[PDB]
Every structure is written in C-alpha cells, then in structure tokens.
Amino acid sequence: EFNILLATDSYKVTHYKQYPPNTSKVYSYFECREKKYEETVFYGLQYILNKYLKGKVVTKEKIQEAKDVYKEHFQDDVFNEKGWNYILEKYDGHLPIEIKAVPEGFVIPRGNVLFTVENTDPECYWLTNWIETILVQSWYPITVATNFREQKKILAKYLLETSGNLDGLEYKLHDFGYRGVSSQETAGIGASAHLVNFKGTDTVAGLALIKKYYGTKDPVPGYSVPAAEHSTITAWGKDHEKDAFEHIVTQFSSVPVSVVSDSYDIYNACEKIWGEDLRHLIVSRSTQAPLIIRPDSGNPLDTVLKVLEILGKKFPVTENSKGYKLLPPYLRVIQGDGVDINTLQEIVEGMKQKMWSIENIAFGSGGGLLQKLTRDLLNCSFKCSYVVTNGLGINVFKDPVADPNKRSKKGRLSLHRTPAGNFVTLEEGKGDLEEYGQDLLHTVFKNGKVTKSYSFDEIRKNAQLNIELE
Amino acid sequence: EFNILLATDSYKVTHYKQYPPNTSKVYSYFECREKKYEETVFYGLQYILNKYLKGKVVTKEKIQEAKDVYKEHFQDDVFNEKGWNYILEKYDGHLPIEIKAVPEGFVIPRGNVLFTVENTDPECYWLTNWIETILVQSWYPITVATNFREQKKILAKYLLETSGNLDGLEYKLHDFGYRGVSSQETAGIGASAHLVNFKGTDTVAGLALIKKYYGTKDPVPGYSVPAAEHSTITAWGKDHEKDAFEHIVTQFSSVPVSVVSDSYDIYNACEKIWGEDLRHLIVSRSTQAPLIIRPDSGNPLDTVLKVLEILGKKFPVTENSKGYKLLPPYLRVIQGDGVDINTLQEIVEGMKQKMWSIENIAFGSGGGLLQKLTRDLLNCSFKCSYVVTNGLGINVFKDPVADPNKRSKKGRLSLHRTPAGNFVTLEEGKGDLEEYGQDLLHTVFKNGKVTKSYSFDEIRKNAQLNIELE
Ligand SMILES: O=C(NCc1ccc(S(=O)(=O)c2cc(F)cc(F)c2)cc1)c1ccc2n(cc[n+]2[C@@H]2O[C@H](COP(=O)(O)O)[C@@H](O)[C@H]2O)c1
Ligand SMILES: O=C(NCc1ccc(S(=O)(=O)c2cc(F)cc(F)c2)cc1)c1ccc2n(cc[n+]2[C@@H]2O[C@H](COP(=O)(O)O)[C@@H](O)[C@H]2O)c1
C-alpha cells in the first residue's frame, strides 16, 4: 500500500533544514510556461487529490516505515520524524495544505497559473514542496487532454468541410493505446484524458478510473464494438483468410464489426476477398452494423487512399451535398497505425484532395503517441513564488542568466478574466486590488479534505471546442 | 482494486468467438524484433506476474463486475461469462496459462524469443491473448533497463580512458525522473529498471517496488545524499543567495551535499560565491563529504566546461596518472539538465577533449528521457506463432505485403546457445531435434503460480557489462 512519506524525490527529505529560519509559509504554483499548443486543458488534479492526498495519509507505521527506509537510503538520520509526528498528532494525519485550482476541463492559454499550493500551519512550511513531485505528475493528464483536443480540432475542421456537419465527431479518434504505455496506472490516467474529448475507447482501465474519481452521467463514459486482431485471422492458416473473414462477420452479423485486413495482403483482401468473394455478406449488412475495414501497415496516407480507391471501385459510391465521395453506409474504414497529430492532418488533407469525405474514416491512436509526450511539451512547471519569513511576505523567483525561459512568477498569484474576456495572471498579490474582478482559482483541497469536485460531465462541457458550441 | 477481466483491450473481449472452432491451444511469444540498440536487457516480467497474474485473480464478483461494465461498454451482451466461470470453478480462479521466459537481467540480441505464453487447458484457448495487453507492457522496463545499460557503457568507456579504472561507475548516473514520468506506478517500474544498472536514485518508489517483488541483498538497492532545490535557495531572497549556500553546506557539513547554483547566475555563483566568499567552507570539507555543485541551465556541454574552468582557476587542480585534470576531492560537479544518451556522450567527449577526468562529474537523468521511450524503439512485439486446431498443430504468422519488418516467427519456439556461444531462436519446433542443446527459456508461471523467481541480485549480475567483468 501507498505511503506519501515515500512518494517524493529523495532530496526533498532534506529540505526542511534548508529554508530560511522562521519561515511560516511556502507558497508555490504550477503553470504551462509560455514559449502550436497555445492553450491547454487543465485536467487530472482531482484524481491525484482523491487517490493520494486526502484523508488520514499519515500513520505511525508509515512514519516508522519511512524512517527505516531513509536511514538506509541516506546512510544517515536525516528524515524529519518530528515534522510528520506533528501532522499525525495535531491533524490526525490530514495534510495541512490548501490547494487552489482553475476548474477541471478549463481551456487556458499558456503562461497562466493553473494551481497554487501552500501550507495552512506555520510548522508545516516544508510540506508545500514535499508534495511537488506527486502534483507535478498532473503534467501527463493535462498534456494528453490537450493533445487530443488539438486532434479533435483537426477532425472537426475537415469533417465540417467535407460533410457539412459534425455528426460522429466524438467517435472519430478511438483510443488503442493501452499496451503501448508504461503501466496500468498510466493507461487509466491517459485514457481518462482521451475521454475528456472522445467517446470511443479500448482502454478499459479509463472507464474504471473515471467512475471512481469523477463520476459520469451515463453508466460508462466510453464505448467500443467487436473487432478482429491479427491472431484471430492468422490462426486459421495463411490459405484460409477468407474463411476467417466470413466466420467473423457472420458471428457479428447484427452489430458493427471491424476486421484487420492486412495480415498478408491488404489490397488483395479489399479487392478480391471483401470486394468479390464475400461481397454478398457486406452489401446485406444494416446501416447500424457496418463492416469497418482496418489496414494496419504501409504508408498511412497511401494505404488509406488505396483502400478507399479499391472499395470505391467494388461498392456503390455516392456524392454528398458537399461534393465528396461517400462509401455505402454498411462499409467504413479505420486507420490505427502511426496516427499522431502530424499524420492525422496529413491523412485528412490527402483525403480531402482526393475528394473523399471524412465520414468514411475513423482513426485509432496508439500508445507511442502518449509515450512521446513529455512534461517539456507544454513546459509544465512548479515553482515557489512567495514565502513568509519573520512574519514578512517575500516575493521569490528564479531567473537563470543563460535561460530567460526558466524565469518564474513572483509573489501571490490569482487568475482573472480580462475586460475582453480572456485570462490574465496577476502577480505580487495584485489581485487584492480588485481591479480585475473575482479570482478564478477555487479552493479544491484544504486540510485533508477535497473541498470542490467536478463530475466528468462538467469537465467534458468545459473542454468543448468552439466549433462544437457554434 | 484490480480486476484482470477489465485489464485488456476492449476488442479482446470478443475474440473467443473468432478463433477457428475446436482450437485447443493458442501459443504466442514476445520479442524485440530486429531492424544502435543491438542487445536488450530482459527485465520486468516478474513484477507483472506477481502483481497482476498470480493466485486467485478471478472471483464471482469480478465476473459480475465485468459483465455489467461490458454490457454498457458494448451496448450488447458479448462478454464471455461462461469462460471465466469455468476458470473460477475448475481452477479456483487461477489462470490456466504457462509462461516460459529467458532469465531476468539476461542481455540478449534483438530478434530472439524472450518469453512465450500458452494455455494449459483446451477450454482456455482464448486466455492466451486476453493477457497480451498486460504482458506487452513489459516493453517499458525492458526498454528503460536497456537504455540505462547503454548509457553505462558510454560512462565506463570514458571513465576508464580518463582515470584508468571504473571506481564509482555505479553512482555516475543518478535517477532524477520521478516527477517527469506519467504516474506513480510508472515511476516505480522505471526506477527499478534504472537500478538494474546503477545505485544512485531519488525515485523512492523504485526502492519499494524492488523490495516487494524482487528482494535485495542489502537493506535498500539504491542511495542518495542531501541536496538543495531552487526553492530552498530562492526562498532566501535574490540578494541572499550566499546566505542560503552558507546555511545549507553548514547544515550538511559532514556528509556529501549537492547545491544547485544557477538560480540567478551560475558563473558568478561558482567564481565569486563558492570560489571566494565561501571558499573557506569548501576547502575544509572531508573527502567523504564533498560539495557537489549543480548547474541546471544553458547548453549542457558549454555550461559544464565553463563551470569546470572556473573551479579549476579557484581551486587546486591535480593531474592524474592518465594525464587528466582532477578537482580536489572535496569538490565535484553534477549535471542533471537535458542529459540523454546523445548529450551524455557529447559531454564526456567534450570533457575528454578539454583534458578533464570523468571522475569530476556525475549526471542526473530526467523523466522526459523515459517518456520519449516507446515500444517502437526496440520493436517490442507479441504475436501468435502456433495453434492446435482439431488436434493438429499449425504454424501461424503474419506477413503484411507492404512491411516485411512486421513478419512474425512461425511455430513452437525455443532459445539456445550457438556453438560460438551466442543466442539463437529456433522456430517450427526445431528445438525438439536437440541439435542445439537445452532450451534457455524457463517456466516462470504455470496455472496461477510463479514457478521460478529472480532476486534483484541475480538480475544485476546478469545485466553486468563485459568491461565490468574484465
Ligand atoms: O478495432 C479495435 N477495437 C474495436 C473498434 C472497432 C471499431 C472502431 S470505430 O470504427 O471507431 C467505431 C467505434 C464505435 F464506438 C462504434 C462504431 F460503430 C465504430 C473502434 C474500435 C482495435 C484494433 C486494434 C487495436 N485495438 C487496441 C489496440 N490495437 C492495436 O494494438 C496496437 C497498439 O500499439 P501501439 O500503441 O504501438 O500503436 C496497434 O496494432 C493497434 O492497432 C483495438
Ligand atoms: O541533487 C539531487 N538529489 C540528491 C543527489 C545529490 C548528489 C548526487 S551525486 O553527485 O550523484 C552522488 C550520489 C551518491 F549516491 C553519493 C554521492 F556522494 C554523490 C545525486 C543525487 C536532485 C537534484 C535535482 C533533482 N532531483 C530530482 C529531480 N530533480 C530535478 O527535477 C527536475 C526533473 O525534471 P525532468 O524529468 O523534466 O528533467 C530537474 O530539475 C532535475 O534536476 C534530485
């Protein structure tokens, strides 16, 4: 089981000794520093508050456990037993910390305060940055939620242009990333961030996380349909791919089914097997139960265009009111190999140039996508901006000579609406002047309690695209 | 709590219906496919076996939980209740699976079988690839362990060249990556993979994982020492950086201490503050308690060289028996900003060109490093190679026309020593001919039990460098 005393960077065990004497407040903040990704979706903090930070997180056994680990880890007695004892005794092991944050799902320009952290008891001045390590991991859900929102913008633009509406937009990017991320916990967190934007997922761990920590309007927040994998095709033997296809589509005759078609030869599969041998089993399917053919290899754009071209020559094609080609309603395509933000855009643009509607296609996003995301992408950063020492508030910051991009904000911070309705972060306590109306940060955690919560519904609403609102 | 019935990709829920009728065995394998990283360290499977796969992992409540989720997730009844019931009743919820694997810590060339998975009961033919998703996540510890071994090779080469020995090699790359990875679980797994190669870490989660799932020779598998962070320097106020430095080194006068020195001006900090104002507090320190100065911004190579140059002009420098410059034993440097496999090599080479011993420096590795690692780097791949249908064994594989790199191995597999002592993977059951001696894969899991285990000690020994052995 989890011990918060063992869930920090080792050096932070030694920091209580290092602050200026008689420091009664350490106040820190998180932002996605400025200097493509101009706005970020704030999401994921609530998961961390609930799983790791709330309630009685300190016990005598956890204190003794950490004392023993750190004695061996540092080969010395540096662990602050007294400090944690104080928390245990005075607060019944609840953390004397207050966290204020912008609402989950909010879409905020870079370079704004997203949350602040401070101690509520002068003796716990050291606790603020002890928990930096765990809080800074919010970089991941923020970054995943942001990246998928950007992909949703691309899909919305092209779907609107080629079809005239946004029908089905929320099912156009399906999460395939479960196996390609680094852990079960990461799979759940990342999938939950995908689901802020979309409704189709195979990462079941995301469903469980959302139900436990956020809650949903509907029984589940995401959906899937039956589909083959290479093993269920190749198990039939090379010469029996047709038999596998027939078996599978028949077993799933009345619901949508997707069938990977590139095990041996995608082009032969589409033209000869689906297009001729089994064509009678396709054209008889309901609109509510299409076959969704999946290529999974080759150049993504070339293979999609070539598959569309083949199907278009074997199946009746219509031209929609925008002038774009549309497969019959019982037949669609999904591309789930090598799809990232760059290649997604390349494919939909290539489709548009060849006069194919984006209605025809869906995409699957893999795990490598998310693995390539780093805390550096949006410059997710946690810094101390204010301390009280000897009863005097002091505005503090770093400003390394060889990197002005690493300069940090100074003093007490607050987040506001501008007269033009944008966001602004006020430094040095200037929010107190009340020239910019109400601080948009809410207290979400205080003294062991989660004081403000968001349902997954509120988060999805906050994260909507403008084009979705228009 | 964790439900294995909900820990797969959604589509795999539907696969039991898709295999050829009367299939009694599905046998699959994992490899780091061929086609820089020519050999990989096999590590991490044991964590997964113990945490997720062993014992009674199926219960009636878990079956009903999954049934309810999947009914809503698919908007249909597709979940295989009967199959999981069978496991619960016949095997007391233990998984009828056998996994055979190369020993943990083994260093193996690409394109070899690393583990195999098969069902042990004909009714559970579908269970083999149900668990693909969870097993394939072994890509992460394998890849992290491999990447850190490659960095260790670079450090060993340059430390030997510039000092004549490998003293301290195992403390030259310290894990700083806790905050920059995607979750607590990932932090633990990745840190454990780092610790296969090194002994210095700040990712405390790695200690806990190793103690629980592998076990160590010593009380803990990794160590750290006290150190500042920017907040403990900047909290003093801009004009009092000197006061912060003095306070910190005095508080830690008798143990090693590292102090980040770039809050405002790294070059002034080294030349004027450490080099003049506080120089008397440095030259008085024990060899067992050096000050380790940390730059953390600017071009990594340039800043390291400039810091060395400055310290060399303010402190007595010796020339070792190899002809390289060496700071006094109470003074060292650590660079923990932007260090990856490329930049590490650039820095040690640049140091070598300026005649500085690698004894002078240590490195910190960040989280972005590990985030940039993907399952694609070593081409980690899980494929079905053999099925038994109608009592007949059939060798199966995929071979997509537009990507011969995605071709898979055929038939029953085994791993062997070659006459020249290298590794070879035999396909199509050819291992049974016994022309290549004993299969190197061991049964590590069978029917709910972990049948062979490795201590962290055996893994570290297996993963040693050749130069360490020589
Ligand atoms: O089909 C799969 N699921 C079912 C499915 C069927 C149809 C649609 S749809 O047309 O959007 C649609 C949605 C809807 F809600 C309703 C509808 F009617 C239709 C969506 C989903 C399916 C397929 C593949 C798959 N996977 C999970 C991992 N994978 C593979 O695993 C690998 C991932 O590894 P990397 O991370 O390295 O990339 C890669 O091979 C990757 O293809 C899942
Ligand atoms: O000093 C730090 N720990 C103590 C320490 C002191 C000395 C040595 S040594 O000279 O090897 C040594 C080892 C030994 F065993 C014994 C000895 F005697 C000496 C090692 C370790 C320390 C410092 C910084 C630090 N951190 C943890 C995260 N961070 C920062 O957090 C950020 C990471 O974010 P990204 O993932 O995006 O990169 C980045 O700013 C990164 O610098 C930890």
Query: What is the DSSP-derived secondary structure letter of residue B201?
Result: B
Residue A293 pairs in a beta bridge with A259, A333
Q: Copy the structure tokens of residue B432.
A: 């049974």
The phi, psi pair for B100, rounded to 5°, reads: -115, 135
Provide the CA B153 distance to its chain's centre, in angstroms: 15
Upper half-sphere CA count for residue B395 (Cβ side, 13 Å): 11
- A334 and B11 in contact (C-beta within 8 Å)? no
End-to-end CA distance of chain A: 47
| SS3 state at B454 | coil
Largest CA distance in chain B: 84
Residue A304, classed as helix, strand or coil, is helix
Residue burial B256-280, b: 16+ Cβ < 10 Å; e: rest: bbbbbbbbbbbbebbbbbbbeebee
CB A11 within 8 A of CB A129: no
Q: Do B73 and A9 touch (CB under 8 A)?
A: no
Rounded Cα distance, B14 and A453, in Å:
36
Closest CA to B391 of B18, B22, B16: B22
A465 phi-psi bin (left φ>0, alpha ψ -120 to 50, beta other): beta
Q: Where are the domains of chain B?
A: 1-136+375-453, 137-374+454-470
Q: What DSSP line would sit under A61-75, residue for residue? A: HHHHHHHHHHHHHHT
Any A CB within 8 A of B438 CB = no
Method: X-ray
Rounded CA-CA distance A188/A48 in Å is 13
CB B359 within 8 A of CB B162: yes
Interacting residues of B297 by C-beta distance below 8 A, sequence separation 6+: A400, A402, A403, A406, B262, B266, B303, B337
Task: Give the three-class secondary structure for A370.
Answer: helix
Taking a C-beta distance cutoff of 8 angstroms, is the pair A110, A378 a contact?
yes
Across B2-157, where does the E strand assignment appear?
23-32, 39-41, 97-101, 107-109, 113-119
Query: Could you say which residues from 239 to 258 on chain B have a Cβ atom under 8 Å away from some Cβ of chain A?
Result: 240, 243-244, 247-248, 251-252, 255, 258
Token pair of B74 as six digits: 């698919």
Which one of B47, B48, B223, B231 makes the best mutation probe of the A interface by having the most chain A beta carbons within 10 Å?
Answer: B231
CB A267, CB A298: distance < 8 Å: no
Q: Tell me if B408 sits within 8 A of B381, measured CB to CB.
A: yes
Task: Give how far Cα B160 sits from Cα of B156, B224, B335, B341, B362, Å.
Answer: 6, 24, 20, 18, 15
Strands B442-446 and B449-450: antiparallel
Select the residue from A2, A8, A17, A18 to test the B interface by mutation, using most B Cβ atoms within 10 A.
A18
Q: Which residue has the tokens 């990989």?
A: B40
3-state secondary structure of A410: coil
Euclidean distance between CA atoms B304 and B312, whole angstroms:
12
Phi, psi values for residue B246, rounded to 5°: -65, -45
Q: Where are the alpha helices (DSSP H) in A195-278?
A: 204-213, 230-234, 241-251, 266-268
DSSP string, B351-387: HHHTTB-GGGEEEEE-HHHHHT--TTTTTEEEEEEEE
Sheet of A97-101, strands arranged across: A392-395, A380-389, A23-32, A113-119, A97-101, A442-446, A449-450
Cα–Cα distance between A286 and A114 in angstroms, integer? 48
Mark B69-80 as b/e (b = at least 16 C-beta within 10 Å).
Answer: bbeebbeeebbb
CB-facing half-sphere around the CA of B53: CA atoms within 13 A: 30
CB-based contact (8 Å) between A10 and chain B?
Answer: yes
| Closest-CA residue to A10 (of B50, B227, B117, B325) | B227
What is the DSSP secondary-structure string of B21-32? TTEEEEEEEEEE
DSSP strands (E only) in A202-349: 257-260, 291-294, 318-319, 325-326, 331-335
Return d(Cα B431, Cα A160) in angstroms, integer. 58
First to last CA, chain B: 47
How far apart (Å, rounded) are the C-alpha atoms in residues A29 and B429?
60
String of DSSP letters for B402-440: T-GGG----SS-EEEE-TTS-EEEE-TTGGGG-SS-S--
**Nearest-5° Cα angle at A366, A362 to A370:** 125
- CA atoms of A81 and A64, how far apart (whole Å): 8
Q: Which residue has the tokens 């810091």?
A: B307
**With contacts defined as CB-CB under 8 Å, which chain B residues touch A72?**
218-220
Judge whether B4 and B62 are in contact, CB under 8 Å: yes
CA B340/CA A64 separation, integer angstroms: 36
- CATH H-level, domain A137-374+454-470: superfamily: Aldolase class I (3.20.20.70)
- Helix residue ranges, H only, B214-286: 230-234, 241-251, 266-268, 279-282
DSSP label at residue B449: E
Cα(A367) to centroid(ligand 2), Å: 29
CA distance B403 to B399: 8
- CA B14/CA B29 separation, integer angstroms: 21
What does the CA dihedral B311, B313, B318, B320 come to, rounded to 10 degrees? 70
Q: Which run of H or of E encompasses B342?
A: helix B341-353
Exposed, middle or buried: residue A148 (CB in 10 Å: 0-12, 13-18, 19+)? buried
Q: 3-state class of A91 per DSSP?
A: helix
Closest-CA residue to B172 (of B186, B154, B188): B154
C-alpha–C-alpha distance, residues B424 and B429, integer Å? 13
Q: How far is A387 from chain B (nearest CA, A)?
A: 6
CA A113 to each of CA A376, A467, B40: distance values in angstroms, whole numbers, following the listed order: 17, 26, 43
Q: How many CB atoms lie within 10 A of CB A162?
A: 22
Q: Decide: helix, strand or coil at residue A316.
A: coil
Closest partner CB to B297 (pick from A15, A72, A402): A402
Q: Which amino acid is at B61?
A: E
Q: Do the Cβ atoms of A365 and A344 come closer than 8 Å? A: no
Strand order in the sheet with A331-335: A173-175, A361-365, A331-335, A291-294, A257-260
Environment class of A300 (CB within 10 Å of its CB; exposed 0-12, middle 13-18, buried 19+): buried
CA distance B344 to B339: 6
CA of A94 to the centre of ligand 1 (A): 43
